[PDB]
PDB file of N, CA and C in Angstrom:
ATOM      1  N   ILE A 209      78.415 101.751  42.304  1.00  0.00           N
ATOM      2  CA  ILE A 209      78.300 102.446  43.565  1.00  0.00           C
ATOM      3  C   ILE A 209      78.481 101.622  44.826  1.00  0.00           C
ATOM      4  N   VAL A 210      79.575 101.685  45.482  1.00  0.00           N
ATOM      5  CA  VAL A 210      79.921 100.703  46.555  1.00  0.00           C
ATOM      6  C   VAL A 210      79.878 101.386  47.770  1.00  0.00           C
ATOM      7  N   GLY A 211      79.238 100.858  48.941  1.00  0.00           N
ATOM      8  CA  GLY A 211      79.337 101.563  50.163  1.00  0.00           C
ATOM      9  C   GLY A 211      79.639 100.477  51.273  1.00  0.00           C
ATOM     10  N   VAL A 212      79.986 100.720  52.444  1.00  0.00           N
ATOM     11  CA  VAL A 212      80.142  99.933  53.446  1.00  0.00           C
ATOM     12  C   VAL A 212      79.545 100.260  54.667  1.00  0.00           C
ATOM     13  N   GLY A 213      78.664  99.287  55.220  1.00  0.00           N
ATOM     14  CA  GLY A 213      77.923  99.445  56.369  1.00  0.00           C
ATOM     15  C   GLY A 213      78.329  98.592  57.523  1.00  0.00           C
ATOM     16  N   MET A 214      78.527  98.883  58.803  1.00  0.00           N
ATOM     17  CA  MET A 214      79.011  98.249  59.863  1.00  0.00           C
ATOM     18  C   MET A 214      77.855  97.841  60.708  1.00  0.00           C
ATOM     19  N   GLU A 215      77.889  96.515  61.091  1.00  0.00           N
ATOM     20  CA  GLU A 215      76.596  95.930  61.724  1.00  0.00           C
ATOM     21  C   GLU A 215      76.856  95.910  63.349  1.00  0.00           C
ATOM     22  N   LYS A 216      78.037  95.507  63.750  1.00  0.00           N
ATOM     23  CA  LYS A 216      78.518  95.629  65.244  1.00  0.00           C
ATOM     24  C   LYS A 216      79.962  95.633  65.393  1.00  0.00           C
ATOM     25  N   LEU A 217      80.275  96.092  66.500  1.00  0.00           N
ATOM     26  CA  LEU A 217      81.802  96.294  67.001  1.00  0.00           C
ATOM     27  C   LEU A 217      82.017  95.632  68.198  1.00  0.00           C
ATOM     28  N   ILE A 218      83.077  94.873  68.240  1.00  0.00           N
ATOM     29  CA  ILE A 218      83.417  94.118  69.283  1.00  0.00           C
ATOM     30  C   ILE A 218      84.708  94.594  70.133  1.00  0.00           C
ATOM     31  N   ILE A 219      84.891  94.732  71.429  1.00  0.00           N
ATOM     32  CA  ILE A 219      85.943  95.241  72.064  1.00  0.00           C
ATOM     33  C   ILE A 219      86.632  93.989  72.827  1.00  0.00           C
ATOM     34  N   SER A 220      87.850  94.207  72.700  1.00  0.00           N
ATOM     35  CA  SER A 220      88.698  93.052  73.194  1.00  0.00           C
ATOM     36  C   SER A 220      89.748  93.743  74.229  1.00  0.00           C
ATOM     37  N   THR A 221      89.573  93.868  75.589  1.00  0.00           N
ATOM     38  CA  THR A 221      90.454  94.509  76.548  1.00  0.00           C
ATOM     39  C   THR A 221      91.585  93.790  76.775  1.00  0.00           C
ATOM     40  N   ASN A 222      92.682  94.438  76.836  1.00  0.00           N
ATOM     41  CA  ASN A 222      93.948  94.132  76.846  1.00  0.00           C
ATOM     42  C   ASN A 222      94.536  94.136  78.319  1.00  0.00           C
ATOM     43  N   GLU A 223      94.317  93.323  78.949  1.00  0.00           N
ATOM     44  CA  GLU A 223      94.781  93.203  80.369  1.00  0.00           C
ATOM     45  C   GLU A 223      95.468  92.104  80.846  1.00  0.00           C
ATOM     46  N   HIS A 224      96.313  91.928  81.966  1.00  0.00           N
ATOM     47  CA  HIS A 224      97.145  90.900  82.298  1.00  0.00           C
ATOM     48  C   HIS A 224      96.875  90.662  83.735  1.00  0.00           C
ATOM     49  N   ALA A 225      96.526  89.494  84.172  1.00  0.00           N
ATOM     50  CA  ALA A 225      96.011  89.151  85.453  1.00  0.00           C
ATOM     51  C   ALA A 225      96.787  88.037  86.063  1.00  0.00           C
ATOM     52  N   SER A 226      97.420  87.962  87.197  1.00  0.00           N
ATOM     53  CA  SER A 226      98.265  87.142  87.812  1.00  0.00           C
ATOM     54  C   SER A 226      97.761  86.770  89.208  1.00  0.00           C
ATOM     55  N   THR A 227      98.107  85.579  89.749  1.00  0.00           N
ATOM     56  CA  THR A 227      97.717  85.133  90.771  1.00  0.00           C
ATOM     57  C   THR A 227      98.832  84.022  91.352  1.00  0.00           C
ATOM     58  N   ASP A 228      98.981  84.266  92.753  1.00  0.00           N
ATOM     59  CA  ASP A 228     100.056  83.500  93.354  1.00  0.00           C
ATOM     60  C   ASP A 228      99.609  82.972  94.629  1.00  0.00           C
ATOM     61  N   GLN A 229     100.404  81.808  95.209  1.00  0.00           N
ATOM     62  CA  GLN A 229      99.966  81.313  96.588  1.00  0.00           C
ATOM     63  C   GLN A 229     101.034  80.478  96.887  1.00  0.00           C
ATOM     64  N   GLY A 230     101.616  80.643  98.295  1.00  0.00           N
ATOM     65  CA  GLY A 230     102.563  79.876  98.634  1.00  0.00           C
ATOM     66  C   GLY A 230     102.625  79.458 100.070  1.00  0.00           C
ATOM     67  N   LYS A 231     103.296  78.434 100.630  1.00  0.00           N
ATOM     68  CA  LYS A 231     103.212  78.062 101.874  1.00  0.00           C
ATOM     69  C   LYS A 231     104.755  78.212 102.515  1.00  0.00           C
ATOM     70  N   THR A 232     104.935  78.222 103.800  1.00  0.00           N
ATOM     71  CA  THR A 232     106.166  78.233 104.620  1.00  0.00           C
ATOM     72  C   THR A 232     106.279  77.494 105.778  1.00  0.00           C
ATOM     73  N   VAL A 233     107.510  77.033 106.245  1.00  0.00           N
ATOM     74  CA  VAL A 233     107.511  76.222 107.530  1.00  0.00           C
ATOM     75  C   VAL A 233     108.841  76.688 107.943  1.00  0.00           C
ATOM     76  N   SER A 234     109.165  76.580 109.165  1.00  0.00           N
ATOM     77  CA  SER A 234     110.292  77.071 109.940  1.00  0.00           C
ATOM     78  C   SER A 234     110.483  76.419 111.285  1.00  0.00           C
ATOM     79  N   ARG A 235     111.741  76.208 111.596  1.00  0.00           N
ATOM     80  CA  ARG A 235     112.011  75.741 113.006  1.00  0.00           C
ATOM     81  C   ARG A 235     113.187  76.447 113.596  1.00  0.00           C
ATOM     82  N   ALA A 236     112.934  77.195 114.762  1.00  0.00           N
ATOM     83  CA  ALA A 236     113.982  78.076 115.301  1.00  0.00           C
ATOM     84  C   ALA A 236     114.100  77.555 116.656  1.00  0.00           C
ATOM     85  N   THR A 237     115.561  77.405 116.952  1.00  0.00           N
ATOM     86  CA  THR A 237     115.929  76.941 118.309  1.00  0.00           C
ATOM     87  C   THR A 237     116.866  77.868 118.816  1.00  0.00           C
ATOM     88  N   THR A 238     116.901  77.987 120.215  1.00  0.00           N
ATOM     89  CA  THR A 238     117.509  79.023 121.134  1.00  0.00           C
ATOM     90  C   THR A 238     118.236  78.391 122.273  1.00  0.00           C
ATOM     91  N   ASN A 239     119.478  78.621 122.442  1.00  0.00           N
ATOM     92  CA  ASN A 239     120.120  78.285 123.726  1.00  0.00           C
ATOM     93  C   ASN A 239     120.772  79.404 124.440  1.00  0.00           C
ATOM     94  N   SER A 240     120.170  79.995 125.310  1.00  0.00           N
ATOM     95  CA  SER A 240     120.598  81.083 126.091  1.00  0.00           C
ATOM     96  C   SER A 240     121.410  80.836 127.362  1.00  0.00           C
ATOM     97  N   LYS A 241     121.758  81.874 128.095  1.00  0.00           N
ATOM     98  CA  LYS A 241     122.599  81.639 129.315  1.00  0.00           C
ATOM     99  C   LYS A 241     122.510  82.928 130.049  1.00  0.00           C
ATOM    100  N   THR A 242     122.490  82.900 131.528  1.00  0.00           N
ATOM    101  CA  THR A 242     122.431  84.038 132.443  1.00  0.00           C
ATOM    102  C   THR A 242     123.590  83.682 133.407  1.00  0.00           C
ATOM    103  N   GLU A 243     124.191  84.899 133.879  1.00  0.00           N
ATOM    104  CA  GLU A 243     125.193  84.983 134.934  1.00  0.00           C
ATOM    105  C   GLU A 243     124.959  86.229 135.643  1.00  0.00           C
ATOM    106  N   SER A 244     124.166  86.348 136.682  1.00  0.00           N
ATOM    107  CA  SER A 244     123.938  87.442 137.495  1.00  0.00           C
ATOM    108  C   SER A 244     124.659  87.470 138.879  1.00  0.00           C
ATOM    109  N   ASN A 245     125.144  88.600 139.094  1.00  0.00           N
ATOM    110  CA  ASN A 245     126.071  88.894 140.361  1.00  0.00           C
ATOM    111  C   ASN A 245     125.515  90.149 141.092  1.00  0.00           C
ATOM    112  N   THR A 246     125.346  90.154 142.332  1.00  0.00           N
ATOM    113  CA  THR A 246     125.051  91.331 143.180  1.00  0.00           C
ATOM    114  C   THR A 246     125.639  91.269 144.612  1.00  0.00           C
TER     115      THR A 246
ATOM    116  N   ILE B 100      97.847 121.346  42.271  1.00  0.00           N
ATOM    117  CA  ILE B 100      98.360 122.017  43.303  1.00  0.00           C
ATOM    118  C   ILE B 100      97.761 121.273  44.536  1.00  0.00           C
ATOM    119  N   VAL B 101      98.562 120.448  45.125  1.00  0.00           N
ATOM    120  CA  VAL B 101      97.989 119.673  46.163  1.00  0.00           C
ATOM    121  C   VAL B 101      98.593 119.934  47.531  1.00  0.00           C
ATOM    122  N   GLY B 102      97.946 120.299  48.528  1.00  0.00           N
ATOM    123  CA  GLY B 102      98.381 120.567  50.003  1.00  0.00           C
ATOM    124  C   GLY B 102      97.668 119.582  51.110  1.00  0.00           C
ATOM    125  N   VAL B 103      98.065 119.589  52.197  1.00  0.00           N
ATOM    126  CA  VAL B 103      97.751 118.896  53.195  1.00  0.00           C
ATOM    127  C   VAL B 103      97.639 119.747  54.452  1.00  0.00           C
ATOM    128  N   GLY B 104      96.388 119.554  55.009  1.00  0.00           N
ATOM    129  CA  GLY B 104      95.866 120.428  56.213  1.00  0.00           C
ATOM    130  C   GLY B 104      95.563 119.602  57.340  1.00  0.00           C
ATOM    131  N   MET B 105      96.186 119.920  58.515  1.00  0.00           N
ATOM    132  CA  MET B 105      95.915 119.161  59.703  1.00  0.00           C
ATOM    133  C   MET B 105      94.857 119.833  60.719  1.00  0.00           C
ATOM    134  N   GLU B 106      94.026 118.936  61.115  1.00  0.00           N
ATOM    135  CA  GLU B 106      92.770 119.318  61.947  1.00  0.00           C
ATOM    136  C   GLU B 106      92.912 119.174  63.395  1.00  0.00           C
ATOM    137  N   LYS B 107      93.435 118.088  63.871  1.00  0.00           N
ATOM    138  CA  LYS B 107      93.630 117.905  65.314  1.00  0.00           C
ATOM    139  C   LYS B 107      94.780 116.777  65.564  1.00  0.00           C
ATOM    140  N   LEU B 108      95.333 116.775  66.646  1.00  0.00           N
ATOM    141  CA  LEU B 108      96.379 115.891  67.102  1.00  0.00           C
ATOM    142  C   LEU B 108      95.935 115.109  68.229  1.00  0.00           C
ATOM    143  N   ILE B 109      95.970 113.762  68.338  1.00  0.00           N
ATOM    144  CA  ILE B 109      95.695 112.930  69.536  1.00  0.00           C
ATOM    145  C   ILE B 109      96.963 112.351  70.039  1.00  0.00           C
ATOM    146  N   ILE B 110      97.048 112.343  71.229  1.00  0.00           N
ATOM    147  CA  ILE B 110      98.250 111.661  72.029  1.00  0.00           C
ATOM    148  C   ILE B 110      97.980 110.418  72.840  1.00  0.00           C
ATOM    149  N   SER B 111      98.859 109.365  72.626  1.00  0.00           N
ATOM    150  CA  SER B 111      98.631 108.159  73.234  1.00  0.00           C
ATOM    151  C   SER B 111      99.748 107.881  74.268  1.00  0.00           C
ATOM    152  N   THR B 112      99.485 108.063  75.483  1.00  0.00           N
ATOM    153  CA  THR B 112     100.642 108.087  76.518  1.00  0.00           C
ATOM    154  C   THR B 112     101.005 106.599  76.734  1.00  0.00           C
ATOM    155  N   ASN B 113     102.176 106.169  76.399  1.00  0.00           N
ATOM    156  CA  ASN B 113     102.636 104.714  76.409  1.00  0.00           C
ATOM    157  C   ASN B 113     103.045 104.674  77.964  1.00  0.00           C
ATOM    158  N   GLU B 114     102.113 104.170  78.648  1.00  0.00           N
ATOM    159  CA  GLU B 114     102.291 104.142  80.170  1.00  0.00           C
ATOM    160  C   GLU B 114     101.721 102.743  80.776  1.00  0.00           C
ATOM    161  N   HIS B 115     102.388 102.307  81.596  1.00  0.00           N
ATOM    162  CA  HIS B 115     101.977 100.853  82.445  1.00  0.00           C
ATOM    163  C   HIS B 115     101.769 101.022  83.777  1.00  0.00           C
ATOM    164  N   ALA B 116     100.519 100.560  84.112  1.00  0.00           N
ATOM    165  CA  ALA B 116     100.132 100.651  85.596  1.00  0.00           C
ATOM    166  C   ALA B 116      99.813  99.244  86.125  1.00  0.00           C
ATOM    167  N   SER B 117     100.091  99.106  87.171  1.00  0.00           N
ATOM    168  CA  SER B 117      99.847  97.717  87.783  1.00  0.00           C
ATOM    169  C   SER B 117      99.333  97.927  89.192  1.00  0.00           C
ATOM    170  N   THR B 118      98.465  96.912  89.617  1.00  0.00           N
ATOM    171  CA  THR B 118      97.648  96.824  90.967  1.00  0.00           C
ATOM    172  C   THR B 118      98.044  95.477  91.463  1.00  0.00           C
ATOM    173  N   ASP B 119      98.351  95.480  92.752  1.00  0.00           N
ATOM    174  CA  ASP B 119      98.634  94.213  93.547  1.00  0.00           C
ATOM    175  C   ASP B 119      98.010  94.166  94.825  1.00  0.00           C
ATOM    176  N   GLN B 120      97.473  93.063  95.316  1.00  0.00           N
ATOM    177  CA  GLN B 120      97.135  92.912  96.632  1.00  0.00           C
ATOM    178  C   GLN B 120      97.209  91.554  97.100  1.00  0.00           C
ATOM    179  N   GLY B 121      97.404  91.424  98.545  1.00  0.00           N
ATOM    180  CA  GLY B 121      97.752  90.040  98.989  1.00  0.00           C
ATOM    181  C   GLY B 121      97.157  89.888 100.426  1.00  0.00           C
ATOM    182  N   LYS B 122      97.134  88.542 101.041  1.00  0.00           N
ATOM    183  CA  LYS B 122      96.723  88.096 102.174  1.00  0.00           C
ATOM    184  C   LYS B 122      97.597  87.202 102.850  1.00  0.00           C
ATOM    185  N   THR B 123      97.896  87.144 104.046  1.00  0.00           N
ATOM    186  CA  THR B 123      98.821  86.236 104.765  1.00  0.00           C
ATOM    187  C   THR B 123      98.085  85.799 105.983  1.00  0.00           C
ATOM    188  N   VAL B 124      98.500  84.502 106.354  1.00  0.00           N
ATOM    189  CA  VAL B 124      97.973  83.875 107.580  1.00  0.00           C
ATOM    190  C   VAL B 124      99.230  83.187 108.114  1.00  0.00           C
ATOM    191  N   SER B 125      99.417  83.131 109.378  1.00  0.00           N
ATOM    192  CA  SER B 125     100.581  82.549 110.099  1.00  0.00           C
ATOM    193  C   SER B 125     100.178  82.012 111.561  1.00  0.00           C
ATOM    194  N   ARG B 126     101.133  81.200 112.096  1.00  0.00           N
ATOM    195  CA  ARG B 126     100.749  80.646 113.386  1.00  0.00           C
ATOM    196  C   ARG B 126     102.145  80.160 113.914  1.00  0.00           C
ATOM    197  N   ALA B 127     102.435  80.644 115.010  1.00  0.00           N
ATOM    198  CA  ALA B 127     103.766  80.274 115.670  1.00  0.00           C
ATOM    199  C   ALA B 127     103.473  79.594 117.038  1.00  0.00           C
ATOM    200  N   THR B 128     104.274  78.512 117.349  1.00  0.00           N
ATOM    201  CA  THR B 128     104.229  77.893 118.675  1.00  0.00           C
ATOM    202  C   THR B 128     105.704  77.712 119.307  1.00  0.00           C
ATOM    203  N   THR B 129     105.765  78.016 120.414  1.00  0.00           N
ATOM    204  CA  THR B 129     107.011  78.103 121.353  1.00  0.00           C
ATOM    205  C   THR B 129     106.794  77.330 122.608  1.00  0.00           C
ATOM    206  N   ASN B 130     107.911  76.516 122.975  1.00  0.00           N
ATOM    207  CA  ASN B 130     107.867  75.712 124.249  1.00  0.00           C
ATOM    208  C   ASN B 130     109.205  76.014 124.915  1.00  0.00           C
ATOM    209  N   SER B 131     109.233  77.089 125.707  1.00  0.00           N
ATOM    210  CA  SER B 131     110.514  77.424 126.310  1.00  0.00           C
ATOM    211  C   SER B 131     110.780  76.645 127.457  1.00  0.00           C
ATOM    212  N   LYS B 132     111.989  76.460 127.955  1.00  0.00           N
ATOM    213  CA  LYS B 132     112.346  75.726 129.193  1.00  0.00           C
ATOM    214  C   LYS B 132     113.578  76.665 129.733  1.00  0.00           C
ATOM    215  N   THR B 133     113.569  76.632 131.115  1.00  0.00           N
ATOM    216  CA  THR B 133     114.539  77.455 131.799  1.00  0.00           C
ATOM    217  C   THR B 133     114.864  76.730 132.960  1.00  0.00           C
ATOM    218  N   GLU B 134     116.037  76.507 133.589  1.00  0.00           N
ATOM    219  CA  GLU B 134     116.698  75.939 134.591  1.00  0.00           C
ATOM    220  C   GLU B 134     117.494  76.757 135.450  1.00  0.00           C
ATOM    221  N   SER B 135     116.915  77.687 136.356  1.00  0.00           N
ATOM    222  CA  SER B 135     117.549  78.681 137.089  1.00  0.00           C
ATOM    223  C   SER B 135     118.243  78.039 138.343  1.00  0.00           C
ATOM    224  N   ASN B 136     119.401  78.286 138.568  1.00  0.00           N
ATOM    225  CA  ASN B 136     120.289  77.812 139.749  1.00  0.00           C
ATOM    226  C   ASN B 136     120.746  78.884 140.517  1.00  0.00           C
ATOM    227  N   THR B 137     120.655  78.976 141.686  1.00  0.00           N
ATOM    228  CA  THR B 137     120.935  80.116 142.604  1.00  0.00           C
ATOM    229  C   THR B 137     121.539  79.634 143.952  1.00  0.00           C
TER     230      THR B 137
END
């Protein structure tokens, strides 16, 4: 007479976790002009 | 004479859900110059 008894059960959550981080740098130059008449 | 009887059905919706969040920090510096002639 053979029986099976469980003692404990363990859960393993199946999730995916990500993490990002980045830096930026820029340099904008402008050369305008104006010609007003009245 | 062997038959099979079904008691209940369980549905596992194969679906994928994601959550994202972020933060940003920036700082701009401008040094304009103008030479007006009239």
